[PDB]
Curated annotation (Swiss-Prot):
Family, per entry: Belongs to the NADH:flavin oxidoreductase/NADH oxidase family.
Organism name: Solanum lycopersicum (Tomato)
CDD domains recorded: OYE_like_FMN
A GO MF label: 12-oxophytodienoate reductase activity
Gene induction: By wounding, locally and systemically.
Function statement: Specifically cleaves olefinic bonds in cyclic enones. Involved in the biosynthesis of jasmonic acid (JA) and perhaps in biosynthesis or metabolism of other oxylipin signaling moleclules. It is required for the spatial and temporal regulation of JA levels during dehiscence of anthers, promoting the stomium degeneration program. In vitro, reduces 9S,13S-12-oxophytodienoic acid (9S,13S-OPDA) and 9R,13R-OPDA to 9S,13S-OPC-8:0 and 9R,13R-OPC-8:0, respectively.
InterPro entries linked: Aldolase_TIM (IPR013785), OxRdtase_FMN_N (IPR001155), Oye-like (IPR045247)
Catalytic activity: (1S,2S)-OPC-8 + NADP(+) = (9S,13S,15Z)-12-oxophyto-10,15-dienoate + NADPH + H(+)
Example of a GO biological process term: oxylipin biosynthetic process
This protein's name: 12-oxophytodienoate reductase 3
SUPFAM superfamilies listed in its UniProt record: FMN-linked oxidoreductases
Gene name of the encoded protein: OPR3
Functional pathway: Lipid metabolism; oxylipin biosynthesis
One protein family per Pfam: Oxidored_FMN
Length: 366
């Protein structure tokens, strides 16, 4: 089983290649990590396994989901530390995902009901609705297009949050630049139409992610920094006219940062759209991005035991991250090793607030 051969990612020697994909679950009430998160991440931690936490706020204006944890207050750091200590006690590596939703928010998630921020003033289309704290679905409001001073301050929020994550004991951080959130709202030409230096050309639309990655690398080092993108995913109207060229342009900048900083990033994390008879074309795009990047490649999206085994066997990726199957299988790593049948997941309790129901009450193997 190639999924259980050792792999060295950064300065961390991993015992296997099954990775916990970052997953918002909305159990961190009042944006403070709760003890339920400690139990939840401990259930899934293994000796030498790599975990990525749910998306974590970098500022009071970065949230777009109810009760998502933060890492911008000292109170959040101290609560985050107890969860990291329990995960490390099992011998696992854990990264905190820094997540700014940009325009994918609502006045109920913003201080003083202010408009969310983005690269443009174009709102998300009415085909998509935002989950509200009461379980209903609302309309995405018109975002506010930030200037370059505010851009450098958001970059400052990323750098400040990365240090807070290291202060809490995290092994590193992942930059969430996918799924149509803030960083993706600058990358994709379907959204970014600015006439300044952050929009227009392909290189200009890559400036924001470059400066964010440059800031966290300068603060904590490239070996503790991962980057997640999804150029081929149109989630929340995140459509680019050339997903391959966008991904390649992003990869070339990650390489350039590695050459300049003299160290390699932790990894490149890419999620594919899946979704038919287009499996060969979607696999070619992911392999093209992998072959272009000098470093570790993590593939994500609709992966199974057999699909993940083949991903490492043919060299399409070095690590494979699992999302929904890890929700319903806390011992998913052990189940993949023994080829034991997996349990189904309940979508209704993905985003609920109960600290046990649909969160930590999925049984292990008997
Ligand atoms: N912070 C983030 O980065 C976020 C990432 N997210 C991604 O944005 C999208 C929004 O997801 P969602 O929670 O609003 O529901 P979604 O995954 O899009 O699909 C809803 C329904 O379509 C079903 N569906 C049938 N095909 C499929 C198929 N290829 N794939 C994802 N579902 C499928 C799917 O079946 P499953 O429950 O997954 O078995 C479900 O019934 C997803 O791609 C998700 O990966 C979740 C929200 C947080
Ligand atoms: C409920 C839910 C929450 C998610 N939250 C995040 C998130 O916070 N950050 C992120 O980068 N991806 C998030 N994702 C996407 C997954 O990390 C990953 O891209 C995808 O689920 C992998 O596909 P799979 O579930 O079929 O393995 C989420 C997915 C789901 C279903």
């Amino acid at each position: 089983n190639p999924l259980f051969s050792p792999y060295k990612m950064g300065k961390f020697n991993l015992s296997h290649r099954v990775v916990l994909a970052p997953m918002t679950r909305c159990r961190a009430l009042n944006n403070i990590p709760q003890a339920a998160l400690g139990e939840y991440y401990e259930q899934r931690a293994t000796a030498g396994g790599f975990l990525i936490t749910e998306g974590t706020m970098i500022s009071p204006t970065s949230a777009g989901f109810p009760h998502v944890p933060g890492i911008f207050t000292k109170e959040q750091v101290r609560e985050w530390k107890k969860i990291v200590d329990v995960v490390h006690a099992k011998g696992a590596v854990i990264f905190c995902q820094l997540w700014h939703v940009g325009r994918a928010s609502h006045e109920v998630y913003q201080p003083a009901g202010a408009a969310p921020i983005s690269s443009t003033e174009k709102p998300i289309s009415n085909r998509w609705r935002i989950l509200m704290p009461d379980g209903t679905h609302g309309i995405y409001p018109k975002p506010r297009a930030i200037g370059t001073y505010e851009i450098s301050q958001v970059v400052e929020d990323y750098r400040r949050s990365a240090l807070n994550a290291i202060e809490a004991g995290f092994d590193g951080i992942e930059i969430h630049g996918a799924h149509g959130y803030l960083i993706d709202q600058f990358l994709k030409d379907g959204i970014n139409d600015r006439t300044d230096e952050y929009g227009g050309s392909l290189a200009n639309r890559c400036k924001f992610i470059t400066q964010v990655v440059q800031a966290v690398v300068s603060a904590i080092g490239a070996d503790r920094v991962g980057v997640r993108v999804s150029p081929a995913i149109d989630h929340l109207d995140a459509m680019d006219s050339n997903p391959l060229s966008l991904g390649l342009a992003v990869v070339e900048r990650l390489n350039k940062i590695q050459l300049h900083s003299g160290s390699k990033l932790a990894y490149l994390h890419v999620t594919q759209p899946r979704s038919g008879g287009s499996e060969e074309e979607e696999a070619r795009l992911m392999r093209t991005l992998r072959n272009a990047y000098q470093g570790t490649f993590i593939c994500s999206g609709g992966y199974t035991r057999e699909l993940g085994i083949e991903a490492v066997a043919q060299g399409d990726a070095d690590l494979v991250s699992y999302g929904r199957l890890f929700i319903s299988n806390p011992d998913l790593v052990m189940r993949i090793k023994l080829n034991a049948p997996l349990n189904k997941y309940n979508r209704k309790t993905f985003y609920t607030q109960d600290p046990v129901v649909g969160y930590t009450d999925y049984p292990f193997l008997q």
